[PDB]
Design a protein around this motif. Structure first.
Motif, PDB file in Angstrom:
ATOM      1  N   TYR A 159       4.263   5.377 -20.692  1.00 37.33           N
ATOM      2  CA  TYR A 159       3.353   4.745 -19.797  1.00 37.33           C
ATOM      3  C   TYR A 159       3.281   4.922 -18.650  1.00 37.33           C
ATOM      4  CZ  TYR A 159       0.604   0.518 -18.891  1.00 37.33           C
ATOM      5  OH  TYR A 159      -0.366  -0.596 -18.302  1.00 37.33           O
ATOM      6  N   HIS A 160       4.223   4.827 -18.540  1.00 39.22           N
ATOM      7  CA  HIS A 160       4.726   5.048 -16.727  1.00 39.22           C
ATOM      8  C   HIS A 160       3.987   6.248 -16.317  1.00 39.22           C
ATOM      9  CE1 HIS A 160       7.595   2.044 -16.964  1.00 39.22           C
ATOM     10  NE2 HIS A 160       6.268   1.593 -17.007  1.00 39.22           N
ATOM     11  N   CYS A 161       4.360   7.365 -17.134  1.00 43.72           N
ATOM     12  CA  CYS A 161       3.513   8.944 -16.738  1.00 43.72           C
ATOM     13  C   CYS A 161       2.101   8.906 -16.906  1.00 43.72           C
ATOM     14  CB  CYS A 161       4.410   9.862 -17.530  1.00 43.72           C
ATOM     15  SG  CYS A 161       4.184   9.996 -19.448  1.00 43.72           S
ATOM     16  N   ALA A 162       1.648   8.547 -17.836  1.00 41.53           N
ATOM     17  CA  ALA A 162       0.026   8.208 -17.506  1.00 41.53           C
ATOM     18  C   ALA A 162      -0.489   7.603 -16.758  1.00 41.53           C
ATOM     19  CB  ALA A 162       0.289   7.826 -19.893  1.00 41.53           C
ATOM     20  N   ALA A 163      -0.086   6.825 -16.597  1.00 38.05           N
ATOM     21  CA  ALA A 163      -0.479   6.103 -15.810  1.00 38.05           C
ATOM     22  C   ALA A 163      -0.097   6.726 -14.430  1.00 38.05           C
ATOM     23  CB  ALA A 163       0.114   4.443 -15.694  1.00 38.05           C
ATOM     24  N   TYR A 164       0.902   7.233 -13.932  1.00 33.62           N
ATOM     25  CA  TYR A 164       1.103   7.852 -13.052  1.00 33.62           C
ATOM     26  C   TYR A 164       0.112   9.028 -12.510  1.00 33.62           C
ATOM     27  CZ  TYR A 164       3.640   8.896  -8.390  1.00 33.62           C
ATOM     28  OH  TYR A 164       3.498   9.079  -7.254  1.00 33.62           O
ATOM     29  N   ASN A 165      -0.396   9.675 -13.927  1.00 29.62           N
ATOM     30  CA  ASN A 165      -1.488  10.807 -13.102  1.00 29.62           C
ATOM     31  C   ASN A 165      -2.238  10.496 -13.577  1.00 29.62           C
ATOM     32  OD1 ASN A 165       1.087  12.085 -14.431  1.00 29.62           O
ATOM     33  ND2 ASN A 165       0.591  12.465 -16.697  1.00 29.62           N
ATOM     34  N   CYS A 166      -3.064   8.954 -13.885  1.00 34.02           N
ATOM     35  CA  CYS A 166      -4.418   8.455 -13.247  1.00 34.02           C
ATOM     36  C   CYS A 166      -4.152   8.369 -11.906  1.00 34.02           C
ATOM     37  CB  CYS A 166      -4.068   7.492 -14.722  1.00 34.02           C
ATOM     38  SG  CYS A 166      -6.175   6.633 -13.932  1.00 34.02           S
ATOM     39  N   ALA A 167      -3.096   7.862 -11.769  1.00 33.09           N
ATOM     40  CA  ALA A 167      -2.990   6.697  -9.936  1.00 33.09           C
ATOM     41  C   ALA A 167      -3.285   8.297  -9.540  1.00 33.09           C
ATOM     42  CB  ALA A 167      -1.368   6.200  -9.774  1.00 33.09           C
ATOM     43  N   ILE A 168      -2.134   9.626  -9.613  1.00 34.02           N
ATOM     44  CA  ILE A 168      -1.767  11.073  -9.132  1.00 34.02           C
ATOM     45  C   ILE A 168      -3.947  10.772  -9.317  1.00 34.02           C
ATOM     46  CG2 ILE A 168      -1.879  13.028  -8.551  1.00 34.02           C
ATOM     47  CD1 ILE A 168       1.038  11.844 -10.377  1.00 34.02           C
ATOM     48  N   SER A 169      -4.849  11.302  -9.663  1.00 35.23           N
ATOM     49  CA  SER A 169      -5.762  11.920  -9.844  1.00 35.23           C
ATOM     50  C   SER A 169      -6.951  10.785  -8.939  1.00 35.23           C
ATOM     51  CB  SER A 169      -6.528  10.930 -11.898  1.00 35.23           C
ATOM     52  OG  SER A 169      -6.188  10.142 -11.827  1.00 35.23           O
ATOM     53  N   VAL A 170      -6.473   9.303  -9.381  1.00 33.69           N
ATOM     54  CA  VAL A 170      -7.625   9.343  -8.159  1.00 33.69           C
ATOM     55  C   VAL A 170      -7.316   8.906  -6.742  1.00 33.69           C
ATOM     56  CG1 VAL A 170      -7.936   7.444  -9.950  1.00 33.69           C
ATOM     57  CG2 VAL A 170      -5.803   6.691  -9.045  1.00 33.69           C
ATOM     58  N   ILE A 171      -5.677   9.120  -6.436  1.00 37.84           N
ATOM     59  CA  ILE A 171      -6.045   9.217  -4.765  1.00 37.84           C
ATOM     60  C   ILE A 171      -5.995  10.372  -4.659  1.00 37.84           C
ATOM     61  CG2 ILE A 171      -3.872   8.678  -3.701  1.00 37.84           C
ATOM     62  CD1 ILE A 171      -4.343   6.051  -4.805  1.00 37.84           C
ATOM     63  N   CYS A 172      -6.161  11.191  -5.203  1.00 30.79           N
ATOM     64  CA  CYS A 172      -6.440  12.193  -5.244  1.00 30.79           C
ATOM     65  C   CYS A 172      -8.021  12.556  -4.077  1.00 30.79           C
ATOM     66  CB  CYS A 172      -6.989  13.894  -6.134  1.00 30.79           C
ATOM     67  SG  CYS A 172      -4.829  13.773  -6.918  1.00 30.79           S
ATOM     68  N   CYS A 173      -8.247  11.135  -4.858  1.00 29.68           N
ATOM     69  CA  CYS A 173     -10.399  11.208  -4.087  1.00 29.68           C
ATOM     70  C   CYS A 173      -9.972   9.955  -3.358  1.00 29.68           C
ATOM     71  CB  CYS A 173     -11.442  11.049  -4.941  1.00 29.68           C
ATOM     72  SG  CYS A 173     -11.088   9.481  -6.731  1.00 29.68           S
ATOM     73  N   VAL A 174      -9.392   9.304  -3.523  1.00 30.33           N
ATOM     74  CA  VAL A 174      -8.991   7.820  -2.882  1.00 30.33           C
ATOM     75  C   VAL A 174      -7.364   7.695  -2.032  1.00 30.33           C
ATOM     76  CG1 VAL A 174      -8.902   4.891  -2.730  1.00 30.33           C
ATOM     77  CG2 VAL A 174     -10.504   6.938  -3.940  1.00 30.33           C
ATOM     78  N   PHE A 175      -7.669   7.205  -0.657  1.00 34.66           N
ATOM     79  CA  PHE A 175      -6.765   7.167   0.261  1.00 34.66           C
ATOM     80  C   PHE A 175      -6.025   8.897   0.504  1.00 34.66           C
ATOM     81  CE2 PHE A 175      -6.063   3.601  -1.496  1.00 34.66           C
ATOM     82  CZ  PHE A 175      -6.231   2.593  -1.328  1.00 34.66           C
ATOM     83  N   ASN A 176      -6.763   9.824   0.176  1.00 33.73           N
ATOM     84  CA  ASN A 176      -6.076  11.509   0.347  1.00 33.73           C
ATOM     85  C   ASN A 176      -6.611  11.157   1.060  1.00 33.73           C
ATOM     86  OD1 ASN A 176      -8.909  10.940  -1.026  1.00 33.73           O
ATOM     87  ND2 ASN A 176      -9.002  12.671  -0.404  1.00 33.73           N
ATOM     88  N   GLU A 177      -7.482  10.725   2.399  1.00 39.44           N
ATOM     89  CA  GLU A 177      -7.233  11.446   3.115  1.00 39.44           C
ATOM     90  C   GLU A 177      -5.761  10.745   4.147  1.00 39.44           C
ATOM     91  OE1 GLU A 177      -9.447   9.953   1.601  1.00 39.44           O
ATOM     92  OE2 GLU A 177      -9.604   7.536   2.134  1.00 39.44           O
ATOM     93  N   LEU A 178      -5.151  10.039   3.648  1.00 40.32           N
ATOM     94  CA  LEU A 178      -4.309   9.096   4.728  1.00 40.32           C
ATOM     95  C   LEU A 178      -3.280   9.098   3.332  1.00 40.32           C
ATOM     96  CD1 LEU A 178      -5.373   6.036   6.074  1.00 40.32           C
ATOM     97  CD2 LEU A 178      -4.763   8.457   6.329  1.00 40.32           C
ATOM     98  N   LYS A 179      -1.778   8.759   4.185  1.00 39.22           N
ATOM     99  CA  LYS A 179      -0.635   8.493   2.963  1.00 39.22           C
ATOM    100  C   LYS A 179      -0.687   8.022   1.483  1.00 39.22           C
ATOM    101  CE  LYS A 179       0.543   3.892   3.646  1.00 39.22           C
ATOM    102  NZ  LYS A 179       0.891   3.487   1.759  1.00 39.22           N
ATOM    103  N   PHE A 180      -0.316   8.585   0.955  1.00 39.00           N
ATOM    104  CA  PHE A 180       0.225   8.483  -1.315  1.00 39.00           C
ATOM    105  C   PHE A 180      -0.088   6.999  -0.863  1.00 39.00           C
ATOM    106  CE2 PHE A 180      -0.090   9.376  -5.136  1.00 39.00           C
ATOM    107  CZ  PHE A 180      -1.189  10.232  -5.852  1.00 39.00           C
ATOM    108  N   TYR A 181      -0.346   5.810  -0.444  1.00 37.63           N
ATOM    109  CA  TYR A 181      -0.120   4.878  -0.707  1.00 37.63           C
ATOM    110  C   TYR A 181       1.276   4.220  -1.027  1.00 37.63           C
ATOM    111  CZ  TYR A 181      -0.965  -0.098  -2.210  1.00 37.63           C
ATOM    112  OH  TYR A 181      -1.023  -1.444  -2.943  1.00 37.63           O
TER     113      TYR A 181
END
Lengths: 502, 69, 566, 73
Positions: free
Chosen positions: C526-548
């Motif tokens: 669950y952690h890795c699947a949700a973290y894949n989702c998180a990486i993907s979404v941060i690829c399009c959000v906050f990608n202009e800055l640090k990775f939250y």
């Protein structure tokens, strides 16, 4: 049988002497028949293990010995009333238990076992035939996979030879498999290239038993294979295969008498030649060779032109080696239709290349010397050659070269009149020889022929002309003492090219 | 079968029946725990799944009775 | 001179109407037409007339033109008399027994070919019976009898010259009607090789050409008679089909009409396509209907279209036939793209009867197992061509059972090839079908969903995601089933948000940051699947800055279609 | 200083590829046989020609060539 027992004990009384033993047995497996029926299992297993070890000479010796032994035992069991023992005890059981060359061995065992199935349980003949069809289909669609195709072909040809009432439903499937194998002839090691050509000729021999089906299937397969090969592109100004490799195959194929006779032991080339000629002629009559300017070249069907030139080169390599005796009936007809194409579109070099090879074959057998068909062909050639001779002044090289090559390729009989036509073309050929040798060579050959077979009096007016243009071509001027058996020498002699010096 | 013909070769519901038919000799395994394959055929993610699993179960009684099992 | 004067006469007849026929009447001799017909029968009548070049290849066509020009003229009565005085189609009656059909002699065969060509010229000139005394019966012996005698005796050999001679004889036989049914009978001769089938092998092309005229007549007659003979009617029907496949340069609607006519007659021969004919016969008619399906109208005869069910049910009957070979079943499965619930019924019956649970239960190398693998390869390709959600969900339940039992790579490759294919809305429908079935359980989402979602068009992607935006937001929050559902949701949403970007992003940003940062193996999954989702979404959000912190290709295709192979 | 990764991943054949190493060796050996046949065939043809001057194309001849250009041929 005493020598037989000695050979037996040779294999395992417990460094390649046993390989020589296997060779000796393989040569005279028949000579020991009727006494090798017994002790079958030991021979089978020992040869099986022998064709597995190092010193691949041993492997091949055991393989050849095993196939010869299998052939002999198949013969005897086919001519046995007690046939049950060998066929049931070992063959199907062991071959199924088999599941690299091991697999080919099993397939060959199936093919030879197909014999006695005709003696007993003739339905199992077609049964194993059908299951083999299913198998080879399953090895057909998966993407190596080709190292065993010829074994399948051999076994199915054997069973078909034994078979008499075939399931025609599997006929399109099997012939499509054959043609795709022929297409996959490249990517093949030469030894198994010979294996696969043997398989192809063997399946053709098997097909020869079913006359009408024979003719239809061979026509279809040769047509499809020609289409596949000519479809291969060539450069214009896994590794890609080209049409170039296949020629020897067919050169072997149409000249494979010396081994189809042996295959018959345990008129074909006529039929192969005829079917090939008909197929290629029909393809030519089908060809869509239409072009425009937008002289300026601009083909309407560039793929068709490319395939045309590919097949022209292929057939040019193929045809002259074999007998125009077989080609003789076409020499009047075939060329005619080809002429009809050239008269159609006299802007194609390949037309003239085919005409030149046609006349070369005609003079290979002296079709004319000096029948109404004979006279018709003679006059046809005379008129057409005069036409092309007077029209060649309108062309350039890489088109004209082929034309003049064809013209000079004419026999002396036709040219016995109007030397005026042939003189300028000969001079231009000799001129272009300084750049392109082969035209110079062939023109020199024609000039020798004309000198030989025509009275020199009529050539006197222009010996003063021919010789001056021959001023050209006359203007200028591992390996250690260690005994390696010189495998370099043992390799081969390289294929011949042409040179100025000769 | 050894010669002049041969069978097919190189088990939830139908292959279990094939294997019990093979139980002409020694009347042995492929019935003791291959029934677990029928049980796996009962996992009722399909309707023919469980109907044919129970059909195999109902056949296996006469199979085992006849095979001295 | 001869060609010029005959062109002049053609002009005088056509360009000048009968108002100048008197000027035509100024001929007063009609010997020119005599030497003309001498040339027509023997081109070497004006001398050699030889060379075999364009001039004399063009001679016959304009000669026939002049023949028709005189036929419209009254002086045809002149012509035909002068025609009849030349020959009355009687010389052939003694030219057929000249010890020919072989290399015995060539002059005899040459003159036979010459007279055959002259007769063809007259026929194509409309001179059918002004040369031939009209036989009272529809049958015209003068060609059919000679044809039969030659084809029946010269084989108990032949030449390519004999080939063309016999083809021309067939053409002359086609030049007069009534002979059609005679040939229907003569082919229908079980009299080792069947002699009618023999001649069909000899000249299948001419035979198909003539039977095209009897687009339905001989078709219906033969397939009525087919109740007792199967191989030969099937063979000639397949020849019809392949000819029609070639017969498309003019139009393929000839084949459309042939298929329609045979479909309306389909029940005239019902001894097949059931447990009523041998399995070889059954598979033969399977191939016949397969070629028809490839040939006939596909916009019709796919759903209920007139005579469609009478074969469609037949087709399903073949699907229903449990006595058929599994290979035959896969062959029928290959025909699925040509196509309601009864189809699902027979599909389920077959899939259960062949592989109950797995294919690893069937050992490799066993012909049963190899036939199995060939079959669901056929399913894979048929579905890929058709691209139907029905077979989609079917084969998904087929394979989403155990990892790598039926070579799942071909499976996923077909998915990747069809996800780029099909209309975007169709792909959305397939995706929704495989998503609703998702609600072990991980198998369906893994082997099917992401695979299409990887190669799906971005437009269908939009449509499918807009369906389940909040349907995912809400569903995000046996726990194992719950967490596996969350796994599927993460595995779809990660790629879905990495593809393209409403402003509901922050909600899922928090809903995944908490999920990953949460303090049996399902927890790490669950952690890795949700973290894949998180990486993907941060690829399009906050990608202009640090990775939250090609003519030949058509020929090959026609040959392949005739053999029904790829 | 950087091929160390290349040599690192090259030795991954340590799962007993030695026989397969033989097989690849020998297969590429026949391949080299055909390549050599082709190379010999090409070499049979007269080797390519070398010139000895530069050329500056214009609408007119350029008479500005050098003595080197004149006399090297």
């Amino acid at each position: 049988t005493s020598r037989e027992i000695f050979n037996f004990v040779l294999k395992a009384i417990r460094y390649a002497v046993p390989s020589a033993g296997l060779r000796l047995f393989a040569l005279h497996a028949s000579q020991f028949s009727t006494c090798l029926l017994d002790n079958y299992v030991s021979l089978f297993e020992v040869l099986l293990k022998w064709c597995a070890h190092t010193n691949v000479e041993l492997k091949k010796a055991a393989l050849s010995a095993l196939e010869s032994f299998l052939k002999q035992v198949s013969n005897m069991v086919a001519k046995n009333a007690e046939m049950h023992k060998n066929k049931l005890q070992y063959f199907m059981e062991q071959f199924y238990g088999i599941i690299n060359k091991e697999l080919s061995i099993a397939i060959r065992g199936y093919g030879l076992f197909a014999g006695p199935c005709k003696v007993i349980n003739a339905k199992d003949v077609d049964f194993m035939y059908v299951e083999l069809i299913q198998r080879c289909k399953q090895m057909f669609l998966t993407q190596d996979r080709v190292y065993q195709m010829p074994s399948f072909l051999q076994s199915v040809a054997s069973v078909l030879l034994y078979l008499d009432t075939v399931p025609e439903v599997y006929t399109p499937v099997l012939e499509h498999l054959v043609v795709m194998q022929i297409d996959s002839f490249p990517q093949y090691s030469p030894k198994m290239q010979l294996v696969c050509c043997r398989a192809i000729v063997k399946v053709f021999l098997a097909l020869a038993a079913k006359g009408p089906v024979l003719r239809n299937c061979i026509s279809t397969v040769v047509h499809q294979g020609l289409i596949r090969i000519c479809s291969k592109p060539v450069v214009l100004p896994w590794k890609v295969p080209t049409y170039k490799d296949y020629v020897d195959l067919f050169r072997h194929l149409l000249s494979s008498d010396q081994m189809m006779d042996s295959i018959l032991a345990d008129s074909l080339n006529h039929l192969l030649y005829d079917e090939f000629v008909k197929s290629v002629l029909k393809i030519v009559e089908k060809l869509d060779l239409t072009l425009e300017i937008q002289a300026n070249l601009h083909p309407a069907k560039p793929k068709d032109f490319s395939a045309f030139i590919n097949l022209v080169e292929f057939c040019r390599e193929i045809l002259p080696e074999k007998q125009a005796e077989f080609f003789e009936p076409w020499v009047y007809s075939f060329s005619y239709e080809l002429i009809l194409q050239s008269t159609r579109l006299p802007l194609i070099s390949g037309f003239y290349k085919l005409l030149s090879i046609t006349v070369r074959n005609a003079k290979k057998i002296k079709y004319f010397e000096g029948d109404p068909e004979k006279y018709s062909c003679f006059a046809l050639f005379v008129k057409f050659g005069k036409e092309v001779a007077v029209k060649m002044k309108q062309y350039k090289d890489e088109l004209l070269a082929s034309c003049l090559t064809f013209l000079l390729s004419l026999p002396h009989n036709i040219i016995e009149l109007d030397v005026r036509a042939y003189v300028p073309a000969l001079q231009m050929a000799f001129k272009l020889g300084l750049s392109y040798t082969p035209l110079a060579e062939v023109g020199l050959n024609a000039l020798e022929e004309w000198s030989i077979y025509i009275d020199r009096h009529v050539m006197q007016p222009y010996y003063k002309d021919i010789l001056p243009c021959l001023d050209g071509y006359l203007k200028t001027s591992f390996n250690k003492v260690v005994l390696k058996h010189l495998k370099k020498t043992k390799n081969l002699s390289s294929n011949e090219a042409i040179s100025l010096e000769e | 079968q050894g010669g002049a013909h041969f069978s097919v070769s190189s088990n939830p519901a139908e292959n279990f029946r094939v294997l019990v038919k093979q139980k002409k000799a020694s009347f042995e395994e492929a019935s003791n725990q291959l029934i677990n394959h029928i049980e796996q055929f009962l996992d009722t993610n399909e309707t023919p799944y469980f109907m044919k699993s129970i059909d195999c179960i109902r056949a296996f009684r006469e199979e085992a009775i006849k095979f001295s099992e | 001179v001869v060609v010029r004067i005959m062109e002049f006469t053609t002009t005088l007849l056509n360009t000048s109407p009968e108002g100048w026929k008197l000027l035509k009447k100024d001929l007063c001799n009609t010997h020119l037409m005599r030497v003309l017909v001498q040339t027509l029968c023997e081109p070497a009548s004006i001398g050699f007339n030889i060379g075999d070049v364009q001039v004399m290849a063009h001679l016959p066509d304009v000669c026939v033109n002049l023949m028709k020009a005189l036929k419209m003229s009254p002086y045809k009565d002149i012509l035909e008399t002068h025609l009849r005085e030349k020959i009355t189609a009687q010389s052939i009656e003694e030219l057929c027994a000249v010890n020919l059909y072989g290399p015995d002699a060539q002059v005899d065969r040459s003159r036979l070919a010459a007279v055959v060509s002259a007769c063809k010229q007259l026929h194509r000139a409309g001179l059918l019976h002004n040369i031939l005394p009209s036989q009272s019966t529809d049958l015209h012996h003068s060609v059919g009898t000679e044809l039969l005698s030659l084809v029946y005796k010269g084989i108990a050999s032949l030449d390519l010259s004999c080939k063309q001679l016999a083809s021309g004889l067939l053409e002359l036989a086609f030049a007069f009607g009534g002979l059609c049914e005679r040939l229907v009978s003569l082919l229908l001769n079980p009299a080792h090789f069947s002699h009618g089938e023999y001649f069909y092998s000899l000249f299948s092309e001419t035979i198909n050409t003539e039977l095209l005229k009897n687009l339905d007549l001989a078709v219906l007659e033969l397939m009525q008679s087919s109740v007792d003979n199967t191989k030969m009617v099937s063979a000639v029907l397949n020849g019809m089909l392949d000819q029609s496949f070639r017969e498309r340069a003019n139009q393929k609607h000839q084949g459309l009409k042939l298929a329609t006519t045979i479909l309306q007659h389909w029940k005239k021969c019902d001894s097949w396509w059931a447990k009523d004919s041998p399995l070889e016969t059954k598979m033969a008619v399977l191939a016949l209907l397969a070629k028809i399906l490839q040939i006939d109208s596909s916009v019709s005869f796919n759903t209920s279209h007139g005579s469609f069910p009478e074969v469609f049910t037949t087709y399903i009957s073949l699907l229903a036939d449990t006595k058929l070979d599994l290979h035959l079943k896969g062959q029928a499965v290959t025909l699925l793209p040509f196509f309601l619930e009864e189809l699902r019924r027979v599909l389920e019956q077959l899939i259960v009867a062949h592989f109950p649970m797995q294919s690893r239960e069937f050992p490799p190398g066993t012909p049963r197992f190899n036939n199995y693998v060939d079959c669901m390869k056929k399913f894979l390709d048929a579905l890929e061509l058709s691209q139907s959600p029905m077979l989609l969900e079917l084969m998904t339940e087929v394979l989403c059972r155990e990892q790598q039992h039926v070579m799942e790579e071909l499976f996923q490759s077909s998915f990747r090839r069809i996800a780029r294919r099909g209309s975007c809305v169709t792909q959305v429908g397939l995706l929704e079908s495989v998503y609703e079935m998702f609600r072990t359980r991980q198998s369906f989402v893994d082997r099917s969903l992401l695979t299409l979602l990887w190669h799906c068009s971005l437009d269908a992607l939009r449509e499918f995601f807009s369906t389940i935006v909040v349907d995912a937001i809400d569903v995000l929050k046996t726990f194992d089933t719950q967490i596996t559902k969350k796994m599927g949701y993460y595995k779809i949403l990660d790629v879905m948000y990495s593809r393209l970007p409403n402003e509901l992003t922050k909600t899922l940003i928090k809903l995944c940051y908490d999920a990953f940062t949460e303090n049996l193996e399902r927890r790490r999954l669950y952690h890795c699947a949700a973290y894949n989702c998180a990486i993907s979404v941060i690829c399009c959000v906050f990608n202009e800055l640090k990775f939250y912190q090609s003519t030949l290709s058509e020929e090959m295709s026609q040959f392949d279609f005739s053999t029904g192979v790829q | 200083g950087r091929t160390d990764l290349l040599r690192l991943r090259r030795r991954f054949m340590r799962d007993q590829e030695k026989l397969s190493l033989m097989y690849a060796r020998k297969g590429v050996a026949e391949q080299k046989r055909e390549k050599e046949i082709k190379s010999e065939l090409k070499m049979k043809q007269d080797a390519q020609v070398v010139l000895y001057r530069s050329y500056r194309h214009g609408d007119l001849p350029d008479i500005q060539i050098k003595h080197s250009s004149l006399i090297t041929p």
